[PDB]
Design a binder for this molecule. Sequence first.
Ligand SMILES: [Cl-]
Ligand SMILES: [Cl-]
Ligand SMILES: [Cl-]
Lengths: 247, 246
Amino acid sequence: AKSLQRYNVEYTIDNDLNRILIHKVDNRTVSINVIGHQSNDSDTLDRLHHFPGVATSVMFPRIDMTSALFVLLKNGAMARVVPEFVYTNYHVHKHRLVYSQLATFALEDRTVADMVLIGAPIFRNKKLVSVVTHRHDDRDRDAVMFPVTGIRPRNLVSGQIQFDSNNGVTPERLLTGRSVYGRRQMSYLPNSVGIKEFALTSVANRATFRNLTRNVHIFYNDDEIVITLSEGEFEISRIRFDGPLLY
Amino acid sequence: KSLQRYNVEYTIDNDLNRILIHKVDNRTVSINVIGHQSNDSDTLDRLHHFPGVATSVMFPRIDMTSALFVLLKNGAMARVVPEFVYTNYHVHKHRLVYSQLATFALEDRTVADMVLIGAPIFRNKKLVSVVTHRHDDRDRDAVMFPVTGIRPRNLVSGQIQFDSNNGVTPERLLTGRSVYGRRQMSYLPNSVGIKEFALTSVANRATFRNLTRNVHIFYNDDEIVITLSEGEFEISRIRFDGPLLY
Ligand SMILES: [Cl-]
Ligand SMILES: [Cl-]
Ligand SMILES: [Cl-]
């Protein structure tokens, strides 16, 4: 297999897995690995930059929500896209959650969207800035949405959380009439003790939960994301910011 | 005797240059402007906490385009638009409460000096928040006033429980340094340098397990980094836009 080239990127197309593999950037060998929401926990990813959905030996710089980018298509042409939307994505590697709001572009033409392969280079002023990781067919917008992973854009939030649990992180939809405390979402009144008594009881009993297994939960709806870190049932921390969550 | 404006009953305290709100919506309330560190009274525990306040009344979400009216010491009101974003925080009983907040600016310092700590802030003739902190943004040459309450859309809020009795003291992130956990360091030694420090701390994670939890807030004009650490091991970080109200 001989490598194709575009701008500062040498790559190949893998038709079995329907992916693009980047072999060189700026004239040297790189490792750019698209991760699902959960990595394989390989030690060799430890020494790479992590942004949601990717572990990369190459820095992905900050983009804004107004400048045009060019994403490489399966046929060698490129699509001009403006990442003016905001979606949140995440992955877990070795008991560390990496999450961020990310600038996100949309493709209304699903013929073009199907030509965008996992791992496809995303260019800004003829230099690689990111690669295609995840996609989400948005019902309400009737468009396929593509986050552009990399360094946190201005006006958005990113973070990381170390936890203990081996089941990883699985986001859960926040049901109507429920509020979150720690690991749990509950209605205000009992039935289940109810969120107000639970939160008060968990805080009062802080010392019994000290040093127990740390769990991270991600509660989402269309409008809001809540991320909590808990030990036992005690909520060590919470973060709240705008959805949508790419999931 | 109490003064009354819209749904609020209040008094002006001249000795302390602050406004005390006694009633909202025909009932007795407790609205307490907190510094960056509360006195840790148990009576604040059952109140709503938003940065700089503990309040028995809900402060609803505001947007950054609609007009608000802040009550002045002379009984008149200033029309303000909270179009700016600042971050504020306070600590109550080893819990940090922080949030980006919609913030208005007063360029006229004579009017700003008529805005008192605790002054009611009105939206459509109903209390929505109160004046808490202010900041002379000598860059934009205006006095900035956060409007504390529920996190506005597009902004971030959070809370972190920690152990240390010394509270949280923000620190300016110096040029050429990067943060890991409790520390900001340059990349190369002279100490150990942040790259070597972060790797060693992550490798030695189990040696810091269950040690004292500290929260640090690292800031410059453009960015705020908030970390939670046990010993030197960074449990979590969050990064978002400055400025910090401090
Ligand atoms: Cl590049
Ligand atoms: Cl981060
Ligand atoms: Cl919060």
